[PDB]
Structures are given as C-alpha cells and as structure tokens.
Amino acid sequence: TRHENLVLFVTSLCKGNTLYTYIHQRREKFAMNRTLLIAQQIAQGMGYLHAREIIHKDLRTKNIFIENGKVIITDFGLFSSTKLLYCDMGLGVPHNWLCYLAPELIRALQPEKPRGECLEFTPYSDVYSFGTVWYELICGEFTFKDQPAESIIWQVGRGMKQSLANLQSGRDVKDLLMLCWTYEKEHRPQFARLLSLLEHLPKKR
Amino acid sequence: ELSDEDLEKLGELGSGNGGVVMKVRHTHTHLIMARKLIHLEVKPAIKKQILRELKVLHECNFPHIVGFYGAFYSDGEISICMEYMDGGSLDLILKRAGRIPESILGRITLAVLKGLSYLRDNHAIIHRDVKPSNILVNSSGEIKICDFGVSGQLIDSMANSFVGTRSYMSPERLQGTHYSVQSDIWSLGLSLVEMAIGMYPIPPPAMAIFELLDYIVNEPPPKLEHKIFSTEFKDFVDICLKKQPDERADLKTLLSHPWIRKAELEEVDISGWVCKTMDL
Amino acid sequence: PMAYINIAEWTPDQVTDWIKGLDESMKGYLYEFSKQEIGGRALLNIRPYELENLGMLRIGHQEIVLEAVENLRNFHYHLKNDNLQFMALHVATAAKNLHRELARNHAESTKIDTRILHDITRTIATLKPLVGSLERTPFRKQEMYREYCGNVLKCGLELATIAHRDRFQPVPAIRQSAERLENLANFVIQDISDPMVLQPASLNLVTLKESELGFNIESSYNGIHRVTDIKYNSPAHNSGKIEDGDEIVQINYQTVVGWQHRTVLEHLREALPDVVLTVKKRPKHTKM
Amino acid sequence: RPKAVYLWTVSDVLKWYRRHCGEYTQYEQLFAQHDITGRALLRITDSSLQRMGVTDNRDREAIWREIVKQRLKTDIMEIRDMERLNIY
Ligand SMILES: CC(=O)Nc1cccc(-n2c(=O)n(C3CC3)c(=O)c3c(Nc4ccc(I)cc4F)n(C)c(=O)c(C)c32)c1
Ligand SMILES: Nc1ncnc2c1ncn2[C@@H]1O[C@H](COP(=O)(O)OP(=O)(O)NP(=O)(O)O)[C@@H](O)[C@H]1O
Ligand SMILES: [Mg+2]
C-alpha cells in the first residue's frame, strides 16, 4: 500500500476533500490531461489491488481522495450484505447507490432479513463500477437521474445503459464505456488490459 | 405564524412503527392537530426553494382533502402539520377486519375520484402516490386524502428511499415513461382489488424485488373472476387495470359509470361501521 | 436548440396557430380553442371526452388532432432517448406480452380472438421505427445490420401472414414466431457491442437562401418531413448542412410536426428569401 | 392492387362498408355524419365506436373484427415494401 498511496483504513490518516465534492460543488471543467492522469492512476491502483486476491466490494466516487494530484483509494474492506439493514417499510436505499451496481448484484432482497450473505462479489463485478466513474468524470453528472428506485432496478436488470446524449468525442471512449457495462460477466475486460487501453492516448492536449 | 415553541407532545399509536408522527394539542384555543416528522440533510440554498412550494398546499379548501395548517423547520427536519383524524388509515382497518364490503368500497371510490378530479381540474397536480396507506377516515363518516406530490424538488433532494414488498407503480412507469394522470387509475384499481380480496394480488394465490417488478410488466393483470361480486365492480376494475395507457379511462368517464351512479343514489351507514371497527 | 422550442409553456396563441395547419377543415374551431385558453400542458394531455366541449362532435375531426398531439408528445418527451435500444424495448415487450397471454389462455379448438389480432397489429406497428432507422445512413453500409434487418423482416412477414391468411391451429406457430422475435430483440439489446446503438438523434440549425433549394420533400403517411434527392448543385450542400435522411421540424421558429405536406411546401415557397429551419440530423461522430 | 388506405376518401369508406359488412345496413349512415375517412378508419377504437352509437354488443364486435382484419391486411403491404427496399 505504497505505490499509489493506498490506504488501509491527526499525525496520519488525514481526511479532507474528495472527488465527489470536487466535481459536484466546484463545478469545475476538468482538463482532458487531468482526466487521463486520474483515470490512469485509478486503473493502476485497482490493478495492483486485484493482484493480492482481495476484492474491493464498494467503489464509489466518494471513496477517492486527490491531494496535489496523488490519488488515494480507501474503504475496501467494509461493505457486505449485512451492513445495510432497515425497518419493515422495506430496504433503505441510499440516494446515489443503485447506479453503481452491476446487473448481477441488482437482484437484492426485499424483506431485509436474508440469512447469511445475499450478495456475491467478484472482480468481474468491480470493473463495472469503473465505467460509471469514468462516465461521470467525463460527462459531468450521474446516470439514471430523476428516476425512482423501483424504475432503476428494472431498467438496469434488463441490461441497459444511459443514452450518450451529453458526450462529444471519438468512438474509443464510447467503446470503453460499452466494454465496462457488458451484460455477460466473462466478456468484461480486466484492469491489466484496461490500463493498456487507456494508456494509448485517444487524444493529446 | 406557526412555530415549534407552542407545539406540545401527546400520545401516539406507536414508537417507530413505520414512519414517525406525533399528535400535538395546541396550547392556544386547544387546536388538536397532528405532525409529520420529515428529515432532510440539504444545504440552506435550496431550503428556501423547497419552502416556497408549500403555499399551494394551503391554498386548497376542498372538503375531500385534509387541511393544512403550516410548515416550519426545526433542527435539521422539516415539520409539516395537518388536521388530525381519529380514525386512522385503510391499512390498519384492513389488517384488523380482514376486508371491506362493497358499499364502503364504492363510497371510498367516489370520495377519492372527486378529490382527484378537483385537484387535477384546479391546480393540475398529479397525485402519483395513491395507495390504501394515503386514505384517512374520520369518525363521523367522512373520507379524505393526503400525501400528494406537490413539490418535485423534494423528491430530487430526498435523503433516502424505501422499496418494500408491496409496490403500486404502473407498467409504463417502470419502463421510464413520464408521469401522467392515467398512471393513477392503475394504482387505484390495484388498491381496489387489494381491499376487495384482503392481500396483495400480484403474486397469484418470497422472492426478490426484480422478480416482482418484472412480473408486473409482463404477466396479465389480475382479475376478480374467482369470487361472486357485483358485475359492475368487475367491469370497473377491468377498465381501471389495462396495460396500454390509451385504453385506461380518464377520471371524467368513470364518474358516469353505472357502479358509481348506483353508489351515489344509495345510502349506507359508514359511521356505524367505522365506530364498530375501532374502539368506539 | 432546446431554448427555442418548448411544449409545456406554450401560450394559447401558439396552440391556436399550430392547430391551424393540421387541416383546412378545422378553421372554425380556432375561436373556441382560444376562448377556453388551452395551453401546452393541457394540449399534451388532451382526451376524447374533453374535445366534445369545444363543438368537435365529429370523430374524424378528433382523430387528426389526436394524432398530431401524440406525435408532438413523442417528439418532445423522448427526444433525448430516441436511440436503437429504446426502440428495441417495445419490440420485445409486446412480443413477450403476447406470448405470456397465449400461454396463460391455453386455448384450444377456438378461433383467434379479436384481442389477439389487436396485439399482433400493435406488435407489427412497433417494428416500423426500428426498421426505418436501421436502413438509413448509420446502419446501411455494414453486413451485420442488413442480416438483422432481413431476419426481423422475415419474422414479421411470417407473423402477419399466418394471422391474415386463415383462422384456426396456428397458435403454436404464432407463439414460436413471437419467441423468435423476442430472442432477436434481446440480442440487439444485449449482445451487440457497438457504441452506435446508444447515441440518439440531435437538433441543429440550418440557414438557406431567391434560389429555391431543391430538396424534394417526400412526406410519409405520418407527416415526417424527410429531405430526399438533394440537388447536385454545389451551393446547396456547400452552404447548407442538409443531407439524405434529414428531418425538418421547424420553419422560421414554428413547429410543424404532424402537419400535411401541402402547407409545408406552400409555406416554404411563400417564405422569405432568407429562411431559418431546424433539422433533426442522423447520428454521427465528432471525430475532431 | 388496391390503393393505399391512407389516401382513401369517404366514398371509398362507404363502398368498403357496403361490400365487406353489408349485412349490418342500419349503421352505414353513421360513418357519413362523423366523417370517417381513410386515416380515421385505421385508428378507430372500441370506445370510439361505442360513442358513435353501436349500442348492441354483437354488431359492435362484428364491426370491430372487420376493421381489425382490414388493418391487419394493410400491414403486409408495408412489410413487403420495406423488405424490397432492404434487398435493393
Ligand atoms: C420517489 C417518489 O416517488 N417520491 C415522491 C413522489 C411524490 C410525492 C412524494 N411525497 C411523499 O411521498 N410524502 C410522504 C412520504 C411522506 C410526502 O409527505 C410528500 C410531501 N409532503 C406532504 C404533502 C402534502 C401533505 I397533506 C403532507 C405531506 F407530508 N411533499 C410536499 C411532496 O411534494 C412530496 C415529495 C411528498 C414523494
Ligand atoms: N393526520 C393524521 N391522522 C391520522 N393518522 C395519521 C396522520 N398522520 C399520520 N398518520 C399515521 O401515521 C402512520 C405513519 O405514516 P407514514 O409513515 O407517514 O405513511 P404510511 O402510509 O404509514 N406508509 P407509506 O405508504 O410507506 O408512506 C400511519 O399509520 C398514518 O395513518
Ligand atoms: Mg406519510
């Protein structure tokens, strides 16, 4: 946990601003070079993480910290099928949590009383969340916005993707987005290949 | 005007049972009146924007709508208070009694139809939340309505959400289509079947959320052909429950339906039933 | 683009003006529409019962306004979702609905009920946008799209022929054809990995000049004004952005969706020497 | 090769009513007053017929089925045209 300042979770472990608050409250148009650098750092960090047979079970845009251009990935050993638990009114769904789940995980249970662990996590399902991160970092906002949970669940379970009405670039970035969100698990790429794909610059400056 | 200082604390049906509400008796002239605990974490910039959208909630004095007394903020929560009803809601009565006979169902349908027609005709507000959990019954025999979506910004800024094992959405709603008045009819018909039989009918007489949300869209809509009812009731539910929105009648053409006219011309003792079911 | 054209805030004057071009047999209803002050929000949610309150006692006169309203709603609400996957949704959903209904009915020794023919007609009607978009510019220079078009057209032809030919039983045949249609729709939804099926159409502004731009409009039965046979003269495509398959929706900042072809040509030829239009260009790529 | 149903006029509609469903001869004048052209013949709905004045259930069902058959028969003439265009 040294090469990309990976954090294992006030003289150390300092906390501050993150990527989510940056891109949302600041509303600053990130440069293309900064986008490429951040994506490369995230891909390298996750590829290093995947090499130690430990699965990052919760990747969002609030679990990344940027300080002077150095990326930091945190909280990769907490989430599970038990951490979420709510009353008899049904499952308590956070506001922006249902758009980061791959189709194989979106089949959650309603009665909030599952024996054991309902979900099953694999490295194949983790790369799906990287696609949403890149989409929101290149476009400017989330996916499936202004929709209820009972609609997002069914739309994602059918194997859908948000229509690319806000992106203006070449075919490479859209091809990568389609690669990440593939319906079948085995046909998804791996971070070793994705790092090579992103390394070949689609554009410069 | 309204402030949290002059509101007291009274007895409640339960602690944490479903949502949290708390009866309040005003010190001044003893205004018995309920409260709604709504909790949000929003920056003050949009707080005023939400606040400006509750005046339309008070500028509507139809008989078949619960009154609105005011709204105020107190320590991280938005407080909205409405007239207290000593009867309860159709959910609790359904759980205790077991079902509802035909005449009470007809009177309730008439009341909700009139309320929806008034709201749509006067302010063009689409309910979008119609279920047996949003119909309040008094003790004299009245029927009211509450919790209708007026401010869309509150939905966009809601802190959490819940799903539950019972859903009342429309097949067009689950496919990303917009919200229209025709969506309310499907939910109202589903509620009518629910109170007619006694249980949620979508699983024919458990399993994940997706297996329900995809059973609603594809499988044929439920019907009440398995028991002896009034025929007009069956045709009313049939008209209400149809997959394609264009085949679903608008509220202005079920008000002339034979079942609604028969209900209007009759007279049934609602007060006796509601008094008997509850604790006097 | 979006700022110029809105439908939920239309003043009653704009609703009155747009209705005028629908037909020449609705000149007398403009005053009544103006009296009640029917805005865009009420216009988009018009229903048969309401139309009888403005003296429209004729069903045939109601149908034209209903069609124009439906077209306007489709253009406005789903402008930014009109992509290949969205059209593939209805092709699949209706087929699965019909299949499940047939399986649940389990009918035997009975003729095809009129409801079944109604669903079959609804299903084939959903094929039209898909094939209409597939054979146009984005997907006409590749073999895979042509093969998919041929397969779906063969399935639709079997669907229609089996139903129309004779009555019952063809029920297993129609069920199997529905299953094939559903499978092909699922394949276009999920398996195909090209990024074109995600991008929808887009809006654009075009200026044209006393030269008569010779784009002969070939209006279909739905009133969709599609430009065809652009003249080979250099200035037409050098100064203009028009191309085959382009669709015209606005003339001089005035919506014409769902009109009749006669007035569109009349308006264009009677327009000013300098004209401004709005074109719904087919999907492309900004390769920079 | 009949003409396209989208281009039909009223006279064609009464001719169609005379030929295909001439048994129910007491309802033909209804199509005249309500101006049922070719375009409106396609999208006529059961509610629309009920409004128009087909009180009896059986006659309304028969007319519904006849119009449905006509609409299905005109659907083939579009699929074949699009197939021919695809083959080119
Ligand atoms: C995802 C989704 O469908 N969201 C959605 C969609 C439409 C509606 C609502 N909605 C809701 O459900 N509630 C109930 C649950 C408490 C509200 O109270 C509620 C509410 N307040 C309210 C209004 C009137 C009365 I008289 C009492 C009240 F309390 N106002 C002002 C709203 O405009 C919304 C946002 C509400 C929520
Ligand atoms: N003014 C009121 N009069 C009577 N009962 C009330 C009033 N306000 C709230 N309640 C009751 O308070 C309880 C909790 O309500 P709440 O959680 O807001 O909605 P709900 O209908 O119970 N559930 P849901 O359908 O999931 O939103 C219900 O039993 C209501 O009937
Ligand atoms: Mg409530």
Residue numbers in the entry:
A (entry chain D): 731 to 739, 752 to 947
B (entry chain C): 81 to 285, 310 to 384
C (entry chain B): 0 to 167, 170 to 210, 213 to 291
D (entry chain A): 19 to 106
From the paper:
In flies, CNK, like KSR, acts at a step between RAS and RAF to facilitate RAF activation, but its precise mechanism of action remains unresolved. Notably, the N-terminal part of CNK (denoted CNKNT) encompassing the SAM, CRIC and PDZ domains and a 260-residue linker preceding the PH domain can recruit the KSR–MEK complex in a manner dependent on its physical association with the SAM-domain-containing protein hyphen (HYP; also known as Aveugle). Here we show that the fly scaffold proteins CNK and HYP stabilize the KSR–MEK interaction, which in turn enhances RAF–KSR heterodimerization and RAF activation.
The resultant structure, determined to 3.3 Å resolution, revealed unambiguous Coulomb potential density for the entire CNK–HYP subcomplex, all of MEK including bound AMPPNP and trametinib with the exception of helix α1, and all of KSR kinase domain with the exception of the N-lobe. Disorder of the N-lobe of KSR correlated with the absence of ligand in the kinase active site. Aside from the apparent disorder of the KSR N-lobe, the binding mode of KSR to MEK is similar to that observed for the isolated KSR–MEK structure, with a small 3° pivot of the KSR C-lobe with respect to MEK that eliminates potential for steric clash with CNKCRIC. The largest contact is made between CNK and KSR (765 Å2 buried surface area) and involves the αG–αH linker and helix αH of KSR and helices α1 and α4 of CNKCRIC and the CNKCRIC–CNKPDZ linker. The second largest contact is made between CNKCRIC and MEK (719 Å2 buried surface area) and involves helices α1 and α2 of CNKCRIC and the αG–αH and the αH–αI linkers of MEK. The third largest contact is made between CNKSAM and MEK (330 Å2 buried surface area) and involves the α3–α4 linker, helix α4 and helix α5 of CNKSAM and the APE motif-αF linker, αH–αI linker and helix αI of MEK. Our cryo-EM structure reveals an extensive interaction of CNK–HYP with both KSR and MEK kinase domains, suggesting that CNK–HYP stabilizes the interaction between KSR and MEK.
